[PDB]
């Protein structure tokens, strides 16, 4: 059941070493190669299909990783 949430946390953990609003902000970067997998995993959590401070993506991922870890810990 919680396999999908588990795989995404692990991807975000790997590339640095609610679900709809994060994909909408992330599906703007195309010049970066590592985040491709992250974007593919997020669309499975967002029911409707998503198309097309000013801080970096490295900090947005850190924030998202925290929040996904808290969703897991709550079981949500």
């Amino acid at each position, epitope marked *: 059941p919680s396999t999908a949430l588990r795989e995404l946390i692990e991807e975000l953990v790997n590339i640095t070493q609610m679900y709809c609003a994060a994909l909408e902000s992330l599906i703007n970067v195309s010049g970066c190669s590592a985040i491709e997998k992250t974007q593919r995993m997020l669309s499975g959590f967002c029911p409707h299909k998503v198309s097309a401070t000013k801080i970096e993506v490295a900090q947005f991922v850190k924030d998202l990783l925290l929040h996904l870890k808290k969703l897991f*810990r709550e079981g949500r």
Partner: antibody
Amino acid sequence: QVTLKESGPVLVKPTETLTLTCTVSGFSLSTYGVGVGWIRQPPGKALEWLAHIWWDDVKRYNPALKSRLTISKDTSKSQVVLTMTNMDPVDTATYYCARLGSDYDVWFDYWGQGTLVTVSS
Amino acid sequence: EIVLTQSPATLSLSPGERATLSCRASKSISKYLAWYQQKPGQAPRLLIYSGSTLQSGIPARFSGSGSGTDFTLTISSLEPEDFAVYYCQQHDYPYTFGQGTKLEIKR
């Protein structure tokens, strides 16, 4: 080092309430990633998880016993309290508090010495 | 609701022998299973987490394997101090424990 000590052994008469205190040392109960759980073991039987609380007060409970269980933490006192109401003789067990081995996932790496709780008239 | 069945209930092996304990889930839980060792009058001791990752302090002769339903804790070559009760644990809620396999010294 990381140590966990359960409060002294208690005798509980049936239908009454069990209060256990887990005194913690070697880690702060407000540190990111910290989680303390309660696991019990009836004499000569398997382990059963009861509840665990995280540093940010996020709590998980055993689904079969959710209604009787209450877990809380107090960072300054370095303690984790478990309350179990309406005790049954079948609850007679060694009760363990153990720190979680992950900052999100659930497995227990440091364990307390355990405490015997007998429920009987 | 997923159940962890451990087989066999008791195991008789001599030191030096290769040990194989089994833990089986009634539904897929991926690679997320932990293992504990327990001696009499003592708290459980974590050996392995996430299927196969060896815990610090635990001697290399220990290992785990498997994903989905069929899991295994293996001990390459037994030592006298390795004989005790072994429990598996589901990482996922509601964190079910197995019934436990007792590893006995054959003599």
